Amino acid sequence: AVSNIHFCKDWRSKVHTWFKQPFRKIRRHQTRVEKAKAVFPATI
Amino acid sequence: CKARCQAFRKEVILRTIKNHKDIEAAKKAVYTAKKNAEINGDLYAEADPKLIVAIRIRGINGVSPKIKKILKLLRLRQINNAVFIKANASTIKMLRLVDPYVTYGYPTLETVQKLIYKRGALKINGNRMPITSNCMIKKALGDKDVVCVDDLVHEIYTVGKHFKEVNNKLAPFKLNGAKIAEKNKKIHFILGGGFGNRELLINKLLANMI
Amino acid sequence: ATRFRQTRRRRGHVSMGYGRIGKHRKQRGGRGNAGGQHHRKTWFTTFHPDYFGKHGMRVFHLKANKYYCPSINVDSLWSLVGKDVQAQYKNAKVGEEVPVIDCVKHGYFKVLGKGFLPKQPVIVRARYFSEKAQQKIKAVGGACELTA
Amino acid sequence: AIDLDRHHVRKHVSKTARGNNAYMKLLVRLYGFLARRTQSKFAKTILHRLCLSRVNRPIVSTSKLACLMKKHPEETAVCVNTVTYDSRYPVPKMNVCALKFTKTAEAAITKAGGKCLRFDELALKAPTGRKTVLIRGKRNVREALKHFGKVCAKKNPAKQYKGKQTK
Amino acid sequence: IKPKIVKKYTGHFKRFDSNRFLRVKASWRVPRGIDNRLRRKFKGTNLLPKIGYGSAKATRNMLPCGLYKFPVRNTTDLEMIMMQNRKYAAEISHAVSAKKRQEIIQRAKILNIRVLNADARIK
Amino acid sequence: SKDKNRSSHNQSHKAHRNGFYKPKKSAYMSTKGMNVQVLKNTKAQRKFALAKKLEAKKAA
Amino acid sequence: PLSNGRNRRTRKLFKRPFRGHGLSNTSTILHTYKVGDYVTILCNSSIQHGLPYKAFHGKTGRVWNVNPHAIGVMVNKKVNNRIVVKRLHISPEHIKPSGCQKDFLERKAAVAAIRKQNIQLKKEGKPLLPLPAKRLPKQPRPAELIKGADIKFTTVAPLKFEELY
RNA sequence: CGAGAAUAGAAACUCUUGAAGAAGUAAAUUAUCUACCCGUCUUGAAACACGGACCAAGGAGUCUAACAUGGAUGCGAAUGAGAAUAGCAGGAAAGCUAUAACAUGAAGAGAAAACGAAAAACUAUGAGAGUGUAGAAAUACAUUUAGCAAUAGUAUCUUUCAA
RNA sequence: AUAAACAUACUUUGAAUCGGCCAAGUCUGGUAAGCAGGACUGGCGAUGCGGGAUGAACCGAACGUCGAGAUAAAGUGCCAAA
RNA sequence: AAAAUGAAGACAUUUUAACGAGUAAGGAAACGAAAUGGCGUAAGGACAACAAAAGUAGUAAAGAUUUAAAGUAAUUUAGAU
């Protein structure tokens, strides 16, 4: 199989690790929780 | 239970009696015909031998490709390995192409016996089992009507109708070492060497090699 | 699992499994698919003969949503609704109710004819039909509708 | 030294159930003792096929068992492999015995009136094998087989592992 | 009862070129060099550890006393070989203190178990 | 820096390690390129025997 | 160093037999080759059209297919370490009917003659004949007498040297 | 004279040395035999070929991304759905639940429009399973039945100018 | 005729290698070479051991650790077993 | 390699036979009759006096210098300072 790999360019500076994903889920869930509290038809 | 062992021994005794008749009766007719031919002034032409015993002489290093295959078909895959070979126009020619690696003559009944009694072996289930009984020979060679060890020695000596089946079953004998030559083993026995046809002078070499 | 590699068993070997006469120099014939027509021609000929060249017209902006047309053979039409429903209506005829195997709902547009349908009247509703599919459905005693 | 054609190396035939499946290690113990004692070629055949890798134990769809057991009414099909379901064709009444029955293949066989034996119940019922139809599914249907060889060849090409600039 | 423990080689297989240099330790490492005097098995220097040197299976790992070795850390380990006091001999580990040793040594007398460290860490 | 151009030394003992791979008996039974008249008689009979065989199978 | 020509090294391989020039016979174009016969390829340099490759000259092959003007012949060709199957189409002028099975096809007749008698002797109850003995290499001759009435002797000794000039 | 066979018969010992150190092993020296410098390029190095004064610590096939073959595993015309993302208890960079877009696959060829598979298959060899006879033990023979996998060839069918 | 069930047929994946050298009851260019280039076969390379005092190829013969015996090449005035 | 036996014995079982030199290179882990067998360093999850005080350690750990034993070998164990 003929390889097609686009690593010739710079890639180590074009990486995006997803380590914040466990904490993004919490951050948004603590926004809806604190948005329905203000006025509930806000998050409706 | 074990009353068939008693009856089996009688059959082996009966077969040894009959087997020694063929060897002795054929020996008498050869000598009787030699006396009658001397008296009458005729000449006698002795019959050609039927059995050839070949011994590997050299090692395994430096063998030509075709000669290497002929020795394998003769089952001489090791040095000092003696086998019994049928003699006709083919094996005699095959034993001539590989002469520098074999020495072969003709065995007497006193030599066939010593090799099979002392260095005998059989291939049962693929294992080279040394001969230790007749129930072992009967189990392997019952269908070839060879039930004892004097039936095995007789068939080899006279080259019977079931010689090929008996011959391949016997494993190639592993023999000792002994003085092969007067000069060296690089010249024919005719020139006082080691290899080549030795006729009835192979029994002398096999006597010190068994 | 770096204790399972070949380096852990090839410790003590000087060449490290890469040969003394020809060492493990960096490059062994370019970088990537270099030399496609000069010294690796025996590769792109033995293992990818049609790699080099041009064939076919150019679709400047292909719209892959207009070539989309999943197909279901006739033998698999009855498995959309089930094997219980097939047996329930196994004695139906013309005039009485028969199930409609709406293929478009399940994501199959075309209906092809391959294999054999059970000998029961059946209604098939799908966007496109094959010439030998319609014969197979009709010969069994069914109907072939169209949708959209 | 001795001149031999080739030296003694390991024989390329398996004799145990591979992996650590503590249930497959029992059937081989069970069928490796029935083959030795009964000396029946059916048990040697069953033992031999239980020690084959996954790619050499191809599945037998229920429509293959149906068309193979059409003329064998009272028989117990014996396939040493998984038995899947052919959702396009009906499943008649038959007694089967396999290493693993797929959920829909097990429910379909027993719905029509059949039975789904394991390999322990078969040895108890017919150890030597008396009313069995030995079956094994197709082996050349694998997709990996197409690509083997050189595609450029003139007689039987391969199928050219796809990649860059494919056409 | 004791079978004669027969050894096919009673020496040590020292590393090649360890009697000249100090960076080369006396632990065996088979030479892989092309011109090595030893891996070609030249005469005079042809000593390598080959599986033929392995001692007899019946008397392998057997101490000269005729009993195999069994290490114990506490008095409760002794019970693991209280049935086989004619095959195994206790050997108290080197970390067990001088107080727990007199518990093991005395208990080994009760169960009649030979102990190879009966004079270790004595006062 | 010249070199040895060619030598058949050892090239024949190599080929006899894995011996000459003979062709299978299926290779001697190909029917490609045969007489067009013979291949039309053989096809015209195989169709005739098959039609009478399948009809008998359907009858039973 | 030789060349890559198709018919290279053919000064003595394609030369016609001495006093054998000109036309071929009329049984060359009249023998009937049926599928399955053993024929020998023999390149004929008089007829250039369709001359088989010089590496097949003298090889023995099996007629596999008989075409109106050419006889299909298949032979085994040797490659690097494998033997392949070659399927030529040789005109009858370039091939000769091989008699490799000349001996074999006369042993079959001898056995078939005997087996024909065994189906008659058995029907009429006579003891059936035994099949012919198999072929064996030259066996060691037995012992035979020699009469002393028609005999004569010639002494044999090394010869005294006689000069050749 | 006497094989087989039937019946009767017979093998338990002695001396020397050793807790004053037996046998075995280890260390040093002597004595006969044996022994050229390790690593590497090389057809060939102990080489008058190159690095090496000695010692300690460090020191070189690793990580990610794409494809493929094979060994183990789950499910199987489906598999995955730890795709984002949304909930649960517990406080949790862990654990559980999401009838869910989509990836590979279930259908193949054609540059493309346009299309889209059965004669409910045939032939050959082939894995098994019973029965009886006999050597009489394993095992050999005769006969009824079965056609899986695999290989080759066949009819039939979809697409292509062309299979 | 003889040999062949750890027989026979393979399939998939893959490593190393394509600087070679020597012998000859052989050949070509050369006056000739321990030169250059070849055909068939065995070796050194990749290989120790007994012998040729020493020697990559010569002769014997290819190796797990040993004990006892007949051996092979070749030797039997001393070094040196006879 | 072939037979025998096989829920746990033990030494990776028992019997018979053949075999064992080798640079480059290969033989990943698991696979009861095991589709090669193992030694060592560091870190993580478990197990370690089974009658409710449950691996070793101030009655002297790790380390260092030696002496003996086991293993063909990688190395392990123990005594003394």
Side-chain angles (χ1 to χ4, degrees):
Chain A
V2 177
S3 202
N4 213 11
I5 297 199
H6 294 42
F7 277 11
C8 319
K9 306 168 90 133
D10 188 20
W11 67 285
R12 252 176 272 102
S13 177
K14 288 324 167 185
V15 86
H16 186 236
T17 36
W18 281 46
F19 300 142
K20 326 185 174 196
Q21 178 195 301
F23 299 78
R24 220 190 291 140
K25 203 217 213 159
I26 302 164
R27 180 210 324 293
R28 282 141 140 182
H29 169 54
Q30 223 58 43
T31 292
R32 296 185 271 281
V33 155
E34 266 145 29
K35 184 190 178 210
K37 208 163 307 305
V39 302
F40 222 92
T43 183
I44 192 192
Chain B
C1 55
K2 230 181 207 185
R4 48 206 253 178
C5 262
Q6 268 194 52
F8 174 46
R9 186 180 337 193
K10 276 309 135 188
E11 321 315 319
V12 180
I13 291 284
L14 285 190
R15 274 157 148 75
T16 310
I17 298 304
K18 179 188 59 61
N19 281 358
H20 290 195
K21 250 71 154 162
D22 291 0
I23 286 151
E24 191 46 13
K27 187 147 97 94
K28 151 168 206 171
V30 173
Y31 171 62
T32 277
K34 282 216 209 155
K35 298 295 292 312
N36 312 354
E38 171 178 355
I39 271 75
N40 308 353
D42 308 2
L43 265 84
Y44 191 71
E46 291 76 340
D48 247 10
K50 307 206 283 176
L51 192 68
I52 291 188
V53 47
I55 307 152
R56 176 114 176 211
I57 276 310
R58 277 206 211 256
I60 72 153
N61 284 265
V63 201
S64 322
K66 151 179 134 199
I67 286 99
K68 193 143 114 186
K69 177 92 166 318
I70 299 182
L71 282 135
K72 289 190 183 168
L73 298 206
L74 301 173
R75 262 141 72 253
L76 305 182
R77 292 153 172 275
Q78 196 181 35
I79 197 182
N80 295 346
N81 272 29
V83 304
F84 297 130
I85 288 163
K86 218 190 291 194
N88 34 25
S90 206
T91 82
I92 270 173
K93 160 74 163 302
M94 278 185 345
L95 278 147
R96 206 264 317 292
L97 294 166
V98 310
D99 247 4
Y101 313 109
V102 305
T103 175
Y104 60 101
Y106 311 114
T108 46
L109 185 46
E110 303 100 60
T111 278
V112 180
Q113 282 167 356
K114 295 221 309 275
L115 290 154
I116 295 186
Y117 277 108
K118 190 162 159 39
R119 311 252 171 191
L122 249 70
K123 303 174 316 155
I124 312 156
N125 293 38
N127 301 2
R128 177 179 181 289
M129 281 305 278
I131 290 176
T132 37
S133 202
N134 301 43
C135 261
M136 149 170 154
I137 314 174
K138 178 195 200 187
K139 278 170 176 162
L141 288 165
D143 40 70
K144 304 292 139 187
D145 184 48
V146 178
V147 315
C148 51
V149 86
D150 203 329
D151 222 331
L152 188 88
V153 165
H154 170 86
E155 288 284 351
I156 293 270
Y157 181 56
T158 69
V159 190
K161 37 161 178 81
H162 297 305
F163 175 52
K164 182 220 212 284
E165 292 86 308
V166 152
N167 190 53
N168 58 34
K169 258 282 188 222
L170 273 148
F173 317 111
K174 318 166 109 178
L175 304 194
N176 221 358
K179 305 289 211 160
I180 43 177
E182 300 169 52
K183 314 277 154 241
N184 38 357
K185 70 203 211 167
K186 303 182 203 156
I187 53 196
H188 205 279
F189 174 66
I190 282 146
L191 323 176
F195 65 91
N197 202 332
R198 302 190 188 215
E199 308 287 300
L200 285 137
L201 309 186
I202 193 55
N203 297 286
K204 307 186 42 151
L205 167 70
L206 283 172
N208 320 300
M209 254 186 149
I210 290 156
Chain C
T2 168
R3 45 169 206 297
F4 291 153
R5 318 257 172 129
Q6 202 204 128
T7 181
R8 314 300 321 165
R9 340 185 299 112
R10 253 52 173 151
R11 286 266 171 248
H13 300 27
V14 170
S15 46
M16 182 95 178
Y18 282 108
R20 324 193 92 133
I21 322 159
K23 299 102 176 141
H24 184 195
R25 298 276 150 81
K26 274 147 152 194
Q27 294 310 328
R28 326 183 49 244
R31 257 170 187 204
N33 331 304
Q37 309 169 305
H38 308 310
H39 61 292
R40 305 253 205 69
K41 184 170 188 145
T42 44
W43 201 81
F44 299 104
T45 290
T46 322
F47 299 126
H48 288 89
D50 45 351
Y51 174 86
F52 281 106
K54 272 218 216 178
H55 201 103
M57 51 175 98
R58 314 175 280 143
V59 192
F60 283 144
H61 45 90
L62 180 74
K63 311 195 169 298
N65 274 2
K66 92 185 37 162
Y67 295 26
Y68 179 86
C69 195
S71 90
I72 178 140
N73 314 275
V74 284
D75 56 35
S76 313
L77 275 182
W78 269 112
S79 72
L80 293 189
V81 292
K83 286 259 175 104
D84 59 343
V85 184
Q86 160 194 354
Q88 176 185 341
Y89 285 100
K90 93 187 295 315
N91 270 317
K93 270 111 183 170
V94 46
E96 42 234 17
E97 293 258 26
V98 283
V100 169
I101 314 180
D102 188 295
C103 316
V104 197
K105 292 326 187 181
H106 300 86
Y108 302 116
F109 298 164
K110 199 156 191 129
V111 167
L112 309 180
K114 184 191 168 190
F116 341 101
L117 269 162
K119 304 152 201 273
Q120 320 164 192
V122 57
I123 307 193
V124 183
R125 166 134 52 93
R127 258 165 207 189
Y128 304 84
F129 270 88
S130 148
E131 282 190 52
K132 212 200 281 309
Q134 180 184 275
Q135 308 166 19
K136 289 205 198 249
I137 301 180
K138 290 190 157 157
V140 105
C144 302
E145 294 202 32
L146 297 173
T147 281
Chain D
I2 189 177
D3 163 48
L4 296 167
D5 317 59
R6 91 203 50 85
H7 266 75
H8 302 319
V9 216
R10 164 188 112 78
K11 177 178 271 198
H12 278 279
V13 161
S14 175
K15 281 169 292 157
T16 88
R18 320 152 154 268
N20 264 337
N21 208 346
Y23 303 89
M24 275 265 266
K25 293 296 222 168
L26 207 38
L27 292 177
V28 159
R29 275 275 298 239
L30 158 64
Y31 269 99
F33 146 91
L34 268 152
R36 159 158 43 99
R37 300 285 275 271
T38 72
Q39 286 273 23
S40 61
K41 321 205 261 141
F42 179 92
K44 295 216 187 82
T45 286
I46 285 296
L47 153 76
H48 168 54
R49 298 191 200 172
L50 273 146
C51 311
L52 301 200
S53 36
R54 182 161 144 171
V55 194
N56 289 328
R57 269 189 273 107
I59 55 204
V60 198
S61 76
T62 44
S63 164
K64 217 204 192 152
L65 298 139
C67 59
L68 287 177
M69 295 261 299
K70 228 196 278 281
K71 39 209 292 184
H72 300 137
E74 192 295 349
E75 306 269 11
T76 303
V78 173
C79 33
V80 201
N81 38 44
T82 324
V83 168
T84 81
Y85 183 45
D86 203 21
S87 67
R88 314 157 308 183
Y89 303 131
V91 186
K93 164 153 161 33
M94 63 205 168
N95 319 301
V96 201
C97 163
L99 277 190
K100 182 168 115 185
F101 279 92
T102 279
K103 291 206 298 255
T104 50
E106 181 146 50
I109 288 182
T110 38
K111 167 167 325 159
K115 280 197 64 38
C116 299
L117 315 157
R118 256 73 215 174
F119 259 117
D120 181 299
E121 291 142 304
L122 169 92
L124 195 170
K125 164 152 94 159
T128 66
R130 192 136 288 177
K131 309 294 244 305
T132 67
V133 176
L134 267 168
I135 300 184
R136 38 175 167 164
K138 295 195 93 86
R139 198 179 291 201
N140 63 352
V141 303
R142 200 150 58 92
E143 179 60 28
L145 291 206
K146 325 268 261 195
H147 308 298
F148 289 164
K150 291 139 84 206
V151 31
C152 93
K154 280 198 285 248
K155 278 321 276 189
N156 277 121
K159 267 299 193 163
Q160 189 235 4
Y161 298 121
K162 75 185 302 289
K164 168 202 163 166
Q165 185 178 352
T166 174
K167 62 200 199 53
Chain E
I1 38 182
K2 167 205 148 82
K4 296 191 333 196
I5 304 155
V6 161
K7 321 286 217 98
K8 296 191 213 157
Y9 192 78
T10 42
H12 298 281
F13 285 96
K14 288 163 268 185
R15 187 170 179 161
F16 174 63
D17 220 25
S18 45
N19 36 296
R20 310 190 168 109
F21 295 92
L22 292 169
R23 61 199 193 242
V24 209
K25 279 119 203 139
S27 74
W28 178 255
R29 311 237 177 281
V30 55
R32 308 269 162 89
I34 36 177
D35 310 348
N36 214 281
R37 191 159 330 274
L38 186 44
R39 76 139 274 259
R40 322 209 260 164
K41 304 178 238 204
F42 264 60
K43 181 202 192 176
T45 66
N46 47 13
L47 220 76
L48 306 90
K50 316 212 89 66
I51 205 145
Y53 288 104
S55 51
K57 224 189 282 175
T59 87
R60 192 143 72 199
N61 288 111
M62 225 151 68
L63 306 179
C65 320
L67 311 142
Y68 293 66
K69 181 174 61 77
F70 190 81
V72 297
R73 273 205 196 162
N74 38 32
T75 53
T76 324
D77 266 44
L78 276 166
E79 334 286 1
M80 272 149 89
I81 57 147
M82 89 188 121
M83 306 130 296
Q84 284 139 278
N85 36 283
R86 290 267 186 90
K87 178 198 205 259
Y88 278 118
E91 167 188 89
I92 315 113
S93 280
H94 96 293
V96 186
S97 40
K99 165 151 213 144
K100 196 172 277 186
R101 260 168 207 263
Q102 271 104 60
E103 309 186 338
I104 300 168
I105 281 181
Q106 192 274 343
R107 172 74 54 95
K109 184 182 69 45
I110 274 169
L111 312 167
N112 161 9
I113 294 170
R114 187 181 310 222
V115 154
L116 325 167
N117 300 349
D119 294 299
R121 228 167 255 176
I122 201 83
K123 268 64 63 170
Chain F
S1 99
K2 271 180 94 214
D3 71 298
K4 303 299 226 182
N5 306 286
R6 183 214 170 267
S7 206
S8 274
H9 180 259
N10 206 266
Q11 304 316 322
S12 208
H13 148 267
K14 273 209 320 179
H16 275 113
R17 297 307 287 288
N18 304 346
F20 287 114
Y21 291 126
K22 297 191 321 159
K24 294 299 219 323
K25 200 83 148 30
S26 95
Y28 294 116
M29 312 215 310
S30 194
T31 86
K32 282 189 131 322
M34 249 180 97
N35 207 350
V36 315
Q37 194 65 79
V38 160
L39 274 198
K40 282 208 289 255
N41 306 351
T42 300
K43 170 170 218 142
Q45 188 269 350
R46 287 203 180 115
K47 265 167 111 178
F48 173 80
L50 177 60
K52 105 174 161 206
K53 200 182 316 273
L54 290 211
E55 203 281 334
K57 180 176 64 87
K58 150 180 305 295
Chain G
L2 257 181
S3 323
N4 294 306
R6 209 190 117 85
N7 284 332
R8 81 193 199 202
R9 192 129 203 172
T10 59
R11 183 196 205 97
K12 328 222 173 204
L13 175 58
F14 278 160
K15 195 139 187 70
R16 303 304 311 276
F18 193 59
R19 297 170 10 206
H21 293 248
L23 266 185
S24 85
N25 291 350
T26 325
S27 87
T28 287
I29 60 148
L30 275 186
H31 189 233
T32 89
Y33 306 99
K34 312 195 180 177
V35 162
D37 284 320
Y38 285 88
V39 306
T40 279
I41 314 171
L42 283 185
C43 309
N44 196 10
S45 41
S46 153
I47 304 140
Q48 279 111 26
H49 195 259
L51 192 51
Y53 191 46
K54 98 194 172 84
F56 305 122
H57 170 80
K59 306 253 190 307
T60 307
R62 280 205 94 170
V63 168
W64 61 287
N65 154 84
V66 174
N67 236 333
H69 293 293
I71 302 277
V73 162
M74 81 192 165
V75 317
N76 281 20
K77 198 212 191 197
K78 205 127 74 156
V79 185
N80 164 9
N81 82 326
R82 60 187 207 283
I83 279 187
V84 291
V85 173
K86 284 324 178 186
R87 275 182 218 285
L88 310 122
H89 262 96
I90 341 191
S91 35
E93 284 105 25
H94 295 294
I95 75 187
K96 204 204 60 186
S98 195
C100 47
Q101 272 179 322
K102 165 168 177 294
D103 175 27
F104 180 39
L105 288 198
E106 91 208 332
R107 264 183 261 129
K108 274 168 136 180
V111 156
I114 287 270
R115 213 103 69 167
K116 176 162 261 203
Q117 303 290 343
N118 285 2
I119 83 153
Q120 180 255 113
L121 298 196
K122 157 195 268 311
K123 145 171 46 186
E124 317 244 27
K126 288 157 260 185
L128 30 68
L129 277 168
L131 285 195
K134 71 177 184 181
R135 303 163 16 234
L136 294 145
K138 181 170 206 328
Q139 298 272 262
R141 54 116 184 152
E144 273 141 349
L145 258 301
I146 291 186
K147 280 329 151 183
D150 262 30
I151 217 162
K152 98 184 221 75
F153 300 90
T154 80
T155 320
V156 168
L159 282 173
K160 159 190 133 77
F161 179 55
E162 294 102 350
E163 51 285 19
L164 310 163
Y165 316 101

